[PDB]
Design a protein around this nucleic acid. Structure first.
Lengths: 121, 251, 233, 56
RNA sequence: AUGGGGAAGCUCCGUUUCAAAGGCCUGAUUUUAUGCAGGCCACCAUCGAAAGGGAAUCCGGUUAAGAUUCCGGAACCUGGA
RNA sequence: UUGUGACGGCCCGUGAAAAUCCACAGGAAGGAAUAGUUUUCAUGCCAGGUCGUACUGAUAACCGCAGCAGGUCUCCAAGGU
RNA sequence: UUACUUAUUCAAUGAAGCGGAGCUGGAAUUCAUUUUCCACGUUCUAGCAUUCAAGGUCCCAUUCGGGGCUGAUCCGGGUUG
């Protein structure tokens, strides 16, 4: 019957229904595996004299790390790989273009023992 | 030749106005319902200097009639307006300095400023410091108020065109000599890039119609036709007469 | 009672915030709405030649209702009954060898613009209904002239959507009856009498009559005021 | 500093008076006096207008 | 950029413009959800400063070469529960 | 020398914006008692990613064909005369 | 020369009050039937005006209270010039 009361002199686009995507086929059909697992974020140790000093005195493991890995991923990977709790992670991109991580473990762990478990004294 | 200075000034690369320190466009209140049927009362909060403008501006706060809001309008301050003053704008407003009555509502001989050329354009005429418009007459049939403009021209405007009563503050500004290229520099530094001015006769013929010669002389008549083109229109454009004239306002 | 107080807000020009009024007259409508309304307005304001606005002369409600009741009695066959009929006739030709005349002769309304135009041309059309909603008017603007020349009763009816609902579609734009059953030939004749009196025999008048030219209500008020203060002597 | 204001308590940012941390004491007092005085004047003007309309 | 308008076109203008231009509070809240008869509104994208504006760290020690970044001590801010 | 304060002079020149943070007006809503509210009071728990970071910055690390008397922005600034 | 508005053209707004009609009492030349206009609540002051609005009619199961009408006239949907 009567027209709708419009107290505002403006017209806005009505809130129509928004459906959710229901594809008839999967986009890529196979979920990619984990692009950054512990074995990819933690590549190898660094065995320079300074890094070994950090291991022996600073309780700090020194690793070469995937350039796409952040501190969260490095912490998680070190914990999963060496069964050690870490206290802090520092990272720097070296002048040769690779990531270097100083991972300081908690006082409950010995970096020297973990290093000679890994294989480098 | 070359593209001359007055031709270059229209591209607006370095010749645009320096508007950083300005305080907003000075416009009358929007002609909504109250301005044309009754009045509305606003309050003058602050009177401020506008860079590049000789007249002070007045910020006036009005109550929103349709919603719980305050609307700040930027007015051209009339001489005698002060902070804390009540401004009344509308058809029913009273003939007081600072009010925004329509021309049809003001009587003959009224001094008005920031007058609208058409009802609703929010102020076009008599906006520079010290300038005003005289109300000469009314034509109630097809309501048209006749006014006299600051240049002496007679204009016929609609009777619904708004305007502030009084004269504009900052008058008598050009009575002081600048005394200094420095004062001119600081004046134009926040208006626009139009100063200093090199004379065309001091240029080369590539740079100006007046340039060149073994003496500094214009060469041809400096009065230029209105039908001339860009690059030709340098000098006295469409001059009806020249020379020093002993005369009056003649208006 | 002693706790309540009389507030009343004063809604003068500068007194109180205005209350929520219905502002449907001032809605800033979308462009498509605005073009719809202004297309209507321009068709009204412009002097329309007779061939337009010999339309917009639709039947009245009751005769249109009875016409569409008769045509609903003459409604075409839907998909379900059509498919059942095909199965029945297939069984008939399979078992009785009847030469495709086992199924009865249908009695249905004729739709489709060029089909109905050909029906009027061959004079098979007993009655024709022409919609006034056709988006290009030239599709049917000639049809009353053709019906007049062929002497077939025609009417202009309201609703291509109604005609489509009749012929089991969305929009038919024309309908036509060519055959009628004996039980309601009398009803069709009594309908055609009034249809004819309204449309077919007024053909010359409606072809001479020019339409349109109306102004909006403000312009009507303006010319009313001008006329009054003019004839006031 | 403006963000430094977020770490402090509410007492440090206001005064116990009405309009406490917004307007000064003298301005609050001036606007209280103004409100009361001109609402009383509104009542007086309303009464005077009603009585002059009754006289009319 | 967009809307829109030019231009044969590469593209030009335009930045809120003759646009139907969105995100943001608390309930709905596992007969179905994040739907909705809950509610508020109505900004004009974005980019643009390592000297403008800005949340918060200092001291001592330590290297061949890094440190207001490491270590020891002592704090501060932001966001969460 | 630097910072700050209260002042005074100058201008037909009166000497950015925004993010952001807080506050006020108002009073929606909600709230009792072996317990409600307060996380703008104190204490207590967790986390803080990415990229830069070395060195010169110039009569040898920059530009000028070079380890070129050239050019190239800035901070600190002892004693005597 | 001039009239219409609908083409085209200019301008503003968050298209908010346009055109006309009228609850209401009169300033007020009405021949017994109002053409106008005002009553359609704002002018000594740097205050405040917001929660479908208070009140007033009508009704309810009446549990966080409300639902119509009116406050806040009606008609034409030409946003206005």
């Amino acid at each position: 019957k009567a027209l709708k009361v419009r107290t505002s002199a403006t017209f806005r686009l009505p809130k129509t229904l928004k459906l959710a995507r229901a594809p008839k086929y999967a986009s890529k059909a196979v979920p990619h595996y984990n692009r950054l697992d512990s074995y990819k974020v933690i590549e190898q140790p660094i065995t320079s004299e300074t890094a070994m000093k950090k291991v022996e005195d600073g309780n700090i493991l020194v690793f070469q790390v995937s350039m796409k890995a952040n501190k969260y991923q490095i912490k998680k990977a070190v914990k999963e790989l060496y069964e050690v709790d870490v206290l802090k992670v520092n990272t720097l991109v070296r002048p040769n273009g690779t990531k270097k991580a100083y991972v300081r473990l908690t006082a409950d762990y010995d970096a020297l023992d973990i290093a000679n478990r890994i294989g480098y004294i | 030749g070359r593209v001359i200075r007055n031709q270059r000034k229209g591209a607006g690369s370095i010749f645009t106005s320096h508007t950083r320190l300005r305080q907003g466009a000075a416009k009358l209140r929007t002609l909504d319902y109250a301005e044309r049927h009754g009045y509305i009362r606003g309050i003058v909060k602050q009177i401020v200097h506008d860079s590049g403008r000789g007249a002070p501006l007045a910020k006036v706060v009005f109550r929103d009639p349709y919603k719980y809001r305050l609307r700040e309008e930027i007015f051209i301050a009339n001489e005698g307006v002060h902070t804390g003053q009540f401004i009344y704008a509308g058809k029913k407003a009273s003939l007081n300095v600072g009010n925004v009555l329509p021309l049809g509502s003001v009587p003959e001989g009224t001094i008005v400023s920031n007058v609208e050329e058409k009802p609703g354009d929010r102020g076009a005429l008599a906006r520079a410091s010290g300038n005003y418009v005289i109300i000469i007459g009314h034509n109630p049939d097809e309501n048209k108020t006749r006014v006299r403009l600051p240049s002496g021209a007679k204009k016929v405007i609609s009777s619904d065109a708004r305007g502030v009563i009084g004269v504009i503050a900052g008058g008598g500004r050009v009575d002081k000599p600048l005394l200094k290229a420095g004062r001119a520099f600081h004046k134009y530094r926040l208006k626009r890039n139009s100063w200093p001015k090199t004379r065309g006769v001091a240029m080369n013929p590539v740079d100006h119609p007046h340039g060149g010669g073994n003496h500094q002389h214009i060469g041809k008549a400096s009065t230029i036709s209105r039908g001339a083109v860009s690059g030709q229109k340098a000098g006295l454009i469409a001059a009806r007469r020249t020379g020093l004239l002993r005369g009056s306002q003649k208006t | 009672n002693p706790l309540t107080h009389s507030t009343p807000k004063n809604f003068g020009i500068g007194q109180a915030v205005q209350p929520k009024r219905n502002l449907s007259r001032y809605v800033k409508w979308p462009e498509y709405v605005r073009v719809q309304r202004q297309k209507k307005i321009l068709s009204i304001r412009l002097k329309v030649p007779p061939t337009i606005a010999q339309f917009q002369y639709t039947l009245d409600r009751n005769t249109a209702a009875e016409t569409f009741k008769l045509f609903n009695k003459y409604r075409p066959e839907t998909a379900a009954e059509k498919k059942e009929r095909l199965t029945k006739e297939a069984a008939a030709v399979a078992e009785g060898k009847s030469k495709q005349d086992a199924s009865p002769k249908p009695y249905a309304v004729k739709y489709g613009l060029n089909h109905v135009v050909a029906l009027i041309e061959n004079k098979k059309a007993k009655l024709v209904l022409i919609a006034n909603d056709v988006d290009p008017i030239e599709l049917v603007v000639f049809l009353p002239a053709l019906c007049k020349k062929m002497g077939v009763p025609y009417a202009i009816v309201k609703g291509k959507a109604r005609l489509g609902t009749l012929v089991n579609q969305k929009t038919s734009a024309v309908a036509a009856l060519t055959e009628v059953r004996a039980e309601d030939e009398a009803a069709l004749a009594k309908l055609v009498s009034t249809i004819d009196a309204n449309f077919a025999d007024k053909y010359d008048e409606v072809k001479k009559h020019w339409g349109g030219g109306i102004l909006g209500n403000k312009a009507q008020a303006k010319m009313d005021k001008r006329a009054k203060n003019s004839d006031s002597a | 500093r403006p963000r430094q204001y977020a770490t402090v308590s509410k007492t440090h940012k206001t005064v116990s008076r009405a309009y406490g941390g917004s307007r000064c004491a003298n301005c609050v007092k001036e606007r209280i006096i103004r409100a009361f005085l001109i609402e009383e004047q509104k009542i007086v003007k309303k009464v005077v207008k009603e009585q002059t309309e009754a006289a009319k």
